[model samples]
Target: PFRLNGAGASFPAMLYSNWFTSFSKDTGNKVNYQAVGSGAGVRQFKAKTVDFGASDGAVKDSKQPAEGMVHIPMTGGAIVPAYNNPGCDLKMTQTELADVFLGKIDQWSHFGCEGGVIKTVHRSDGSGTTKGFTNSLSAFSPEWKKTVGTGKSVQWPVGVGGKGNSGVAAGIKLTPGSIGYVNYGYVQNDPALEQPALQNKAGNFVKASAETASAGLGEIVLDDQLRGADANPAGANAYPIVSLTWILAYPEYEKNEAVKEVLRYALTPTQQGKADSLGYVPLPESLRQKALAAVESLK
Candidate 1:
């Protein structure tokens, strides 16, 4: 029996865990994964400390390992502005959305929610979730881009920092008028938190859903490395903040059939079919076919 160890983005941890367990049941191989932040995941991948690394940001060219790597997009999801205001459906244009996190609008009454100072929550660790969320913020506000550019970690203008998605969710749930960004799966699991409708590039305030997120994903064209991102997608029904998570593996594995098996299983329709039910977006058919071809060449 082979044992595979991997680590990376917590955004897709829920879905990845389910896929790994199912893979182990089908084949007698054991796979263990840690839900570490993307920064650590990339570091571990470059260090060759795990069989695979997962990240939503995907490794940039400058950060690539000397031997090279491939980004196999495993899943897609929405980065929702989850808040704790009940009976009030929050709708935010790009400017209003960026301003809230910029600390420009600190009170709930400014957005017509219950009157209270809006407490902001953000990730304390280096995270791809932060990267994607801020990417959209930068697209929406020139002031945001000038002051705080995008990366795995940036100088947050405002908000208390939480360690991960779970931490951010906890912060929002416990504090009245607190808003934080997290993966859609987190919001789906915890019904208490409310997700606001965000205006997309086409000027539609679209709610986050599998259909809306998929619509947004359609705008992204994957690069040669199978990595791509769109901060604000251009579609009437598209949710504004959708991101895809990638699995990082070497171009070739040494004496490791387990690695290929793991990657192949993850890309199969059987596993992809489980995505939406688990609060994730399955890859569109075109991307899936291309991804499968890439996986085949992973010797």
Candidate 2:
């Protein structure tokens, strides 16, 4: 009777769902995961209501468990700027995108697009997506850093707030001239949502794709916990707003061996190979090995 239960991070929900299904098929083990935002996931993990937690941003020091948990890098993904402006091919400079989110640019005409006021949508829930999105915004503008800062939830200078990645995507799709950041996978499945090419650190305007997201993840160097992030990667083709989603497992799994097995299955090369087709970036060899070692280190 092997079962694994996990929750967190809508960013990687689609890929993880497929992984869990395949894992169940392969090993005859059952797994259940919820696409709750990272904050709720962490809360459930802290409450011991779930076996594991997943998140796009690293769990902060303030939220560490008493016994501690190991961060297993699951996969990399791009948080893209998705919009609902029909007929407009939006290509935004780094500053312009930042300013749009910061409430500086209110009109679509500012981007040379024919539209009324630009409606901005942001995450209302505490989310790793929000954290990663804000991290890049913090890097983009000094004003954003000082005023908005970065975290799972932040005080927005302007714009409507949606609940999760799905919520933001839905909000953008429901409203005309609305824009928000969402996981690349969500953007891929939704035909109505239009993703804009954003300028990367190397001055290349890149859209979120597996190759670009993987390139962005190339510069990331994980710490001992297998947790790391590079919000604005310098690769010429790197989609700047990429982040690595993580699986949070406890240091000791004396009674729950299934958790370790599940983590291991997810990190295997074959599972990683599944990422690209699902609109995610597979963890590179080095990061994958490090994550595997972390998973094995757990009792």
Candidate 3:
């Protein structure tokens, strides 16, 4: 049995944890993964502290690594808007959601729904989920791009900031009139948390689901370089907030055969099948093939 370590992106941590349990039972391989958010994951990946790292953000096109690195797109999921309102439910369009985050719309009632004041919750620490959420906002609104902007960590325009997804969840659960962005898996599974209807790419308010979010990843084209040419696609039913989680590893393990084996195991079709069960979208066949090719290219 080989032991491997990875960390990053709380967006898919719940699924990874579940997969890890079964993966160990099936392969007798022990993979230890820390849910250390995206920023730390990138740092650890660069520092070579872990065998692999996960992130929602794609590696920059211009960056070159001292040690060759590979990026494997694993799965996709949605950054849903979850809230903690006792009596009133909230729904938001992409523009409305952007407005709240930009501090332009401070009250829930301003969202064109009858509700109490809206208190926005955001990530206090650096996080990949935050990056994905902001990316989607930027894709939808130029104002959001100019005002609040995109980053692993950004200055918030309104409401409170939590340390992690757990912190945000806990904060929303305790505070009334609070809303935050988290993975759809958490929102769907946690009855205490209520997910508001969000604007789909079609400009309709639609509830987020694994199926709906997964539908957004259809027919993605990969380049010769094995990178996704179009990260975001437009469709009526597509959820704009969908993002792919990635596995980062050195292209050549050199002395770490165990890490190579673990990564190979992770890329297997059998493991990919487990993604949907965890409320994540399975990788598209083209992306998966490109990812596998990238993995094999690792020195």
On TM-score, the candidate that comes out on top is 1
- Model 1 ranges off by over 4 Å: none
* Per-residue accuracy of model 2 over 45-75 as CA lDDT, tens digit each: 8888888888887886677989887788888
Better of 1 and 3 by TM-score: 1
lDDT score, candidate 2, position 199: 94
Error of 3 at 69 (Å): 1.0
The estimated TM-scores of all candidates read: 0.96, 0.95, 0.90
**Residue 214, model 1: Cα distance from true site in angstroms:** 0.6
**What is the Cα-based lDDT of residue 106 in candidate 2?**
94
Model 2, residue 274: distance off in Å is 1.6
Error of 1 at 201 (Å): 1.1
Output the better candidate (2/3) by lDDT. Answer: 2
lDDT of 2 at 83: 91
- On residues 172-287, what C-alpha lDDT tens digit does candidate 3 reach at each position? 88787788888877677787888877777677676766567766766345555544422245677776677777888777775357665666666678887777666678776767
